[PDB]
């Protein structure tokens, strides 16, 4: 496919910078959802997926827990859509 | 493979930031080389390979009509 692929799930990048709600809207309109941090943490995909949006609504990082307490909703970040 | 794909070519990301010469050495160790500007300009691959080193010695970009820099380098 036209992007990354892992275990049968294919993620396409979107270069445009948009907030979380717009990213989710675009992913859903494209018959897809934002990447799940659970499946992307350990796998190599993180190297490409860092500082992109996730389902939980926070940028994806390698930290195990303790998500960013400070609000990140009003921010712009590139997004992947499955 | 572990990385991106185009025309039977696998591109692997080495997230470590390094100069052009260290990037060339690392790719040579892998038996691969840096991407060429021609193959990436006309592809979606560009969105991933932008601001990453190329064989020409300058960062890959669509613009324009240095050994002192370090940037994430792919390997094919």
């Amino acid at each position, epitope marked *: 496919c036209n992007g990354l692929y892992y275990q049968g799930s294919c993620y396409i990048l979107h270069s445009d*910078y948009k907030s979380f709600e717009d990213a989710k809207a675009n992913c859903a309109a494209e018959s897809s959802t934002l990447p799940n941090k659970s499946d992307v943490l350990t796998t190599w995909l993180i190297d490409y997926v860092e500082d992109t949006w996730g389902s939980d609504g926070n940028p994806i990082t390698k*930290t195990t827990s303790d998500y960013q307490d400070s609000d990140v909703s*009003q*921010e712009v970040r590139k997004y992947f859509c499955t | 493979c572990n990385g991106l794909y185009y025309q039977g070519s696998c591109y692997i990301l080495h997230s470590d930031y390094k100069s052009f010469e260290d990037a060339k050495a690392n790719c040579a160790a892998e038996s691969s080389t840096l991407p060429n500007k021609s193959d990436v300009l006309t592809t979606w691959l560009i969105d991933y390979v932008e*601001d990453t080193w190329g064989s020409d010695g300058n960062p890959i970009t669509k613009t324009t009509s240095v050994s002192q820099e370090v*940037r994430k380098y792919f390997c094919t």
Partner: antibody, heavy 121, light 105 residues
Framework: VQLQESGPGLVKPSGTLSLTCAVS?????????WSWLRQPPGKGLEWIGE???????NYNPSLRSRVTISVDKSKNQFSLNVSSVTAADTAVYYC?????????????????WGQGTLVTV | EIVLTQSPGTLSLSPGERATLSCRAS???????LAWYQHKPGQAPRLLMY???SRAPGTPDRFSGSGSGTDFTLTISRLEPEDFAVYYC?????????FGQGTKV
């Protein structure tokens, strides 16, 4: 990439402080996120936002409301307006550059800084 | 907002020493992503290291950095009169990029 900061040193409280920086030896349209930072006198530094050639701006949540960063490509100048000053904003504002922005591989660290102008409210 | 604290506020020395500067984080920083800087009074701040263990071009080899998660540290093996100044920690693994307090020499 030589960055030089220029702006009004004195901005009375609650006014808008506009600091403009000039990009030299490179293009503002290039793949670089231009950020503005703050150094309160004697205290630690902060990060008061960033901008790109497309106008996309990402701010610090604490300072999101007050600040507005803009870009003018004709004069290759990326400027920052801080409104509703509370007299706690006195600092040596710095221009900054963060490699990347066109691709997915943005390097956050601000390698080329610029001599910062000190503004006294 | 990860708050970074630099333990030694001032490490006063005369030229020649294995100076060690340390700085800790409230929360773990992803990938040990901490790039130190330099600040000579008035002069434009520089990028001494990125990634907490890599030296950007233009800085000598005497700067060696090590750390992970909470704790990060910079080390100057030997000191020269043109290499003593304020130093900073910069973590870029959190949504708001947070600096650290200066460590004057």
């Amino acid at each position: 990439v030589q960055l030089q900061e220029s702006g009004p040193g004195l901005v009375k409280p609650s006014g808008t402080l506009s600091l403009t920086c000039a990009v030299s030896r490179a293009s503002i349209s290039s793949s670089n996120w231009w950020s503005w930072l703050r150094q309160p006198p004697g205290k630690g530094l902060e990060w008061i936002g960033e901008i790109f050639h497309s106008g996309s701006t990402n701010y610090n949540p604490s300072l999101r409301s007050r600040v507005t960063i803009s870009v003018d490509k004709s004069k290759n100048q990326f400027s920052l307006n801080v409104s509703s000053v509370t007299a706690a904003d006195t600092a040596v504002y710095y221009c900054a550059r963060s490699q990347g922005g066109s691709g997915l591989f943005r390097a956050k660290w601000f390698d080329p800084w610029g001599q910062g102008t000190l503004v006294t409210v | 907002e990860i708050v970074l604290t630099q333990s030694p506020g001032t490490l006063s020395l005369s030229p020649g020493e294995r100076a060690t500067l340390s700085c800790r984080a409230s929360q773990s920083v992803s990938s040990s992503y901490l790039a130190w800087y330099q600040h000579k009074p008035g002069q434009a701040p520089r990028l001494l290291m990125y990634g907490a263990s890599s030296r950007a071009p233009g800085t000598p080899d005497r700067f060696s950095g090590s750390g992970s998660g909470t704790d990060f540290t910079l080390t100057i093996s030997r000191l020269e009169p043109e290499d003593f100044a304020v130093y900073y920690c910069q973590q870029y693994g959190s949504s708001p990029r947070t600096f650290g307090q200066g460590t004057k020499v």
